[model samples]
Target chain A: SEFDYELPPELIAQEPVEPRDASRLMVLHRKTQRIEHRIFREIIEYLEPGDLLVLNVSKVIPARLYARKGASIEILLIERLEEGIWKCLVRPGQKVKKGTELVIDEDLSAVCLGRGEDGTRILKFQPQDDRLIFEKGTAGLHFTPELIEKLKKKGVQFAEVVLHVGIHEEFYQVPKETVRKLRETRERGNRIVAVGTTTVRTLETIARLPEQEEYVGKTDLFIYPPFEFKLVDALVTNFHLPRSTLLMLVAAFAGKDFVMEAYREAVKRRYRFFSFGDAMLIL
Target chain B: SEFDYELPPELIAQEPVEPRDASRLMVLHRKTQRIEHRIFREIIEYLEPGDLLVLNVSKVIPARLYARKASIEILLIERLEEGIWKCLVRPGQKVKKGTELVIDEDLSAVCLGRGEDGTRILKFQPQDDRLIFEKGTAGLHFTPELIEKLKKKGVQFAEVVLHVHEEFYQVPKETVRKLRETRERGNRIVAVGTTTVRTLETIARLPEQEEYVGKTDLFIYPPFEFKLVDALVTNFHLPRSTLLMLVAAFAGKDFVMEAYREAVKRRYRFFSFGDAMLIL
Candidate 1:
């Protein structure tokens, strides 16, 4: 049930890739209770031809940038939490409370409530226009050059933001979309590999097989712990922040005990953490 | 988590009445605990002046009847579980185990093994099960009956279910035709009702629905939930029945329990023979 584990501070990686897939990987087998090690690239040798390697290809937006107000307010996309307010992690010290407004460029500005423990704040934003606030902030739109360049380098094929819609309140919409797509994919008779949490979030949403095109609207699809992935096959990820939503997602892809065991190992192995770090090949 | 209840056998009624709405009704209010006795004919009184009432007007078939081989058996539409069936009882044991029966002129059958409960085992002929719900108004109780009833009622409209298509696997073709037909009636708007439940469950096996037709024996209990249909007008039900499960879904669990409790305390006659509950 827990998506957390203690990792040594020195093991927390602070930078990105030289050779991205060259990072270390610590594999933990649930049944055997065995922990093995190999370089990230070498781990790919374990793959069989039919085995579709799933990697969370979620390219981190240069979304972590500074917004200059009276004090520098960091408006990172902790995945838009609501209409006006974003689930954000802001900087600067003590004495932060609600109703504190921080203007975010020309389009959006946020009001800081209190700082949540995860470094997020409940700040309501003043809208610059009537566009969908969630999509406007997230729509895979190239907001800046750094992100655009990174996406180009990675060749990320997308239609802006990947919005995973919920079928209702109870289930996610992934299974439905997968079903609809399955009609097409089955023609090729190939397996699937989910790219990221959004993809995973969208796939499991289907309530049944032979899924119809049930994915229409939009949802702040959150994929996290103890999830029985009915659709997803593999996971590609970097180390995640402890107790963060991202971490919860990794916990789901990798089992809880395995994730914790791996996190402990990640720290012990002096591996990098956060959005951009070592790659995890889950087959 | 439990959509549980206990009821005396005196509740489960058989014969449905004319103008469907004339049935007795019992109202349960969870917010403020209370029970009120009324009739379905006057259900409009309970409706908010502007609120919509969605309904399922799928006509039901006389899928119940008797057939015989060496023994008499009451053949209910079926799927065998554990190499046996739980068929409905026909009068005089007119149709017995190891018997062939006909659901309709087109649908033929041959009996195989006897069911555990002494119910007849009639294997239906292998053919594409299909339905034609657009036969007309004042039609059959299965789907057509529901259609004409709503038209005469002149109420709001909602999606309709032809019926119990793929409750177990893929929705049966006959059931899908009905749901689509019902949806065809969806206008600017209309209220949905109990018939909606029967129809949706008939063809739609999953909460997230898709149009298909096949056989489904989905068991909807207390936690048996809904995805589409909104309001429901149902009579009291026997304890631990599928109908009761569906009602619980329409009315919140706590609300249904409170309502049932109050209905019993108020001594309102229960079951299909008894009253109705109008859930918002």
Candidate 2:
């Protein structure tokens, strides 16, 4: 309840700005109630030479597809069972039964294999190709490939982590090799700069684990107050929505008052917010 | 095809006899060309003291039940599981996800999803349990009373719950005991029809799974191993039917074909409502 707030409708940045890093940044100090207002380019000064900047290089999927019989049905492709067979969630489950033939395209057709647990259906499609997953996986995409290269060329040492992200909170997967490096870097008294809220959540999840050579798992770890983050020391994320888990994570890492005070300043200075909004660097 | 023959429509018995058992019975020898024509009651004479009449009590399923959605027709072919039925549907192009179909207000099912083939998966619930039986399959009125009635007439009846196909194939342990008793007694196990042929032949095939209930898809053709059925009482089946193939297997192909040709020549009524044949 304390974390919930209201922002002006105009400040909810609808579109991203050009030059990528041209967006404004609100910096917050973890130990002290201090905040700084500067453009996103000023984030270079806060970064130390030895700090390991962790970036979630995991690709966001466009796994949602639609099929129409008499009525249009939305299918959320969850898991690939095998060739031409996928586990998906289907709407209006009545018409789809055993031997139910669903025609979307001439070649992109699927037959209902069986009923899955919950509201899911097992489908056997015609063309069994992995490229279809990449094509129709989601509704959005991020241009972070250039962003990663630009950051690396700026003399910044980058560590790549991955999570084939689905919709919100569907678990973040990371290899133990990547996690071990972050853990070792932190042990050497170096800072961990997490790229986004997803990166922050992922690093923190894998950090709170047994020392292993390879790790792969999922987490619903809601980062909030009284939480001691093991891996991520500083976070590079966009201005999150009010009352969001993202904002709560930023508040827990940086002092809640310091971050909230920074938000109030950003709002007064007319700094844009949300996905296509200004960035926040919580130290 | 050698099995194909044109039958005059007039020979097809349109209606059944009044008392059912009052139909005519023709006795033919498998090893000889001897034939005897008599009433259905004469079948009791051929059934002797050491002969245990193996009869199939498998109920014939009518399979027609209509759901209220498309006023759709569902023909229940087999009971797939406890709550599920493997039913047939035509032009089932209408049923969709979340479709709720009902027979009545309370006899309803919410379409949960589907299965392999056009099997609509519905979470079904019946308002009355007995309604499933009445709406499902019916039984012939032959039971313990009929057995006692035959026993009174010196023509004893023995029942076998065969593990053959679907519900009919489930052979009980007690029936296994009956089979062994008949075998040990060296009595002739005269099968009533092709259904009994399935039960007895299946029971004879599965000596290891002596007492179990499982579906059998056994195809009895010209070359079939029949160890149990010494004789069978069956009406002449349509040409090329599985029933005809089975009768051929019992009496040898040549003899069976000769019998069919002679029956056509003699103008004995044909098909389900036709006169019965005793191949002993």
Candidate 3:
């Protein structure tokens, strides 16, 4: 398959490295087709003056919780539709029928309203006093304070974009000032380097707008092979799951053949994979 | 007498001037004691690179509402205590204890008692969610376009919050860090309003703490030592108001009062929707 990759099971990182920036980085140069392995902190060396580094600053909410409906049921909160109403994923979809009450605690319980697409359930939690509690980090963890200071001292400017990820979709929001800064960076002939796939998606989504300003909307833009990037000149992202949309985005940025070859090399080197895993800087 | 000044009724602008920046600007140079009259838009010329212009981004809420206790008018001023508000009630003589003024089907206010300055204490109850109101008037002088222009000119901007309350103020931890960085770089912190001045001064008073994200009741008047605010942008205030005192504390009372007389003589608009002052 075009996007398939072979990643050994043991290479999946179960925990983060001691220091966040201590994670390994694999730098991919598109023109030269040369790869260099370095530490995540050393990714700062690749940055040039006036380069705008866009980072995703969305805080992760704990959205996973266990509910008891006679037996235990797992409820993974997807998105809050409205007050007390949520779209969620149930562990045993067979057991949760319409009007099924999943007791979370003495104060909280959720009633399954109906089934949604993709084996998801529409749930309305009890005590609709405008509070629904569910129990669940990682895209911006690598850029520690010291590294950011170093980058700033090197004359690099920074802008932040937020991409809140639901279970099945992503929401992108950028303030007007941030949009202006990004456009100014491009107009000044500086590179826009995105730190994660989420950041890449945010930048690319705004890039599609003719006159980009403040934006608060959902983006379902799927990037795969033969996709052309309009704003992003470079990318710093973690090793994504095989055949995932994130992997496809990376492939779209760096050619699929080159990425697949790099994946092979990474597996051979036993590099940790997925979130809290090693990073790859594509230029 | 030091803070008092004469302003003709005609000089008080009832409505905002067209193209917000088109209002009058009075620039005061502290060293030369020189005053230059110019349009508000031209105030940008005074700003230099590396100057941190701090502005209060607090949005003004529609707090004035008419109620139906025989059409009693009320302006929700500030929350005195939780669920209770200190309000300016027109025809305060009519609104007595236990008089319920129905604002709408959703919300109504009951007159609790009297307060200072002919104001009334009120408790409001809404049919649904808890009613909350923003406390302060933001610097309405700034338009997004003007802000963008200023930023493009290499002048950095930082935002802080201080409700029109003697109780508290808040400078976001990140904003405090930015202020420190600006000071360390030898950049001047130009406060855009009296509220911005209050917030920065409150932060500067607490030198021991690295981060300040809490309430401060730091009051400024004449002869008060200003720790961080190097320049100020403010509107004219009424006599005996704390706002006038803070401005006097920054620019000497004699100069500020003199500027006020000059503003009145020149027919400059006064107060919230009024002309601006740039004290250097």
Highest TM-score against the true fold, candidate: 3
Ranking under TM-score, best-scoring first? 3, 2, 1
Candidate 1 stretches greater than 4 Å from native: A28-34, A50-161, A164-191, A207-210, A220-225, B1-280
Candidate 1 at residue A278, lDDT?
56
Backbone clash count for every predicted candidate, in the order shown: 58, 26, 3
lDDT of 1 by residue, B3-23 (tens): 456443333333355555565
Clashing pairs in model 3, backbone N/Cα/C closer than 3 A: A62-A136, A63-A136, A64-A135
The ten-residue window of minimal lDDT in model 2 chain A covers: A136-145
Candidate 1 chain A: worst 10 consecutive residues by lDDT?
A164-173
Off by over 4 Å in 3: A59-137, A164-170, B1-280
DockQ for model 2?
A: 0.00
Q: What are the runs in model 2 whose C-alpha is more than 4 Å off?
A: A58-154, A166-169, B1-280
Docking class of predicted structure 1: incorrect
**lDDT order of candidates, best first?**
3, 2, 1
DockQ of each: 0.00, 0.00, 0.00
| Each prediction's TM-score versus the true structure | 0.29, 0.37, 0.38
Residue B94 C-alpha lDDT in model 3 = 90
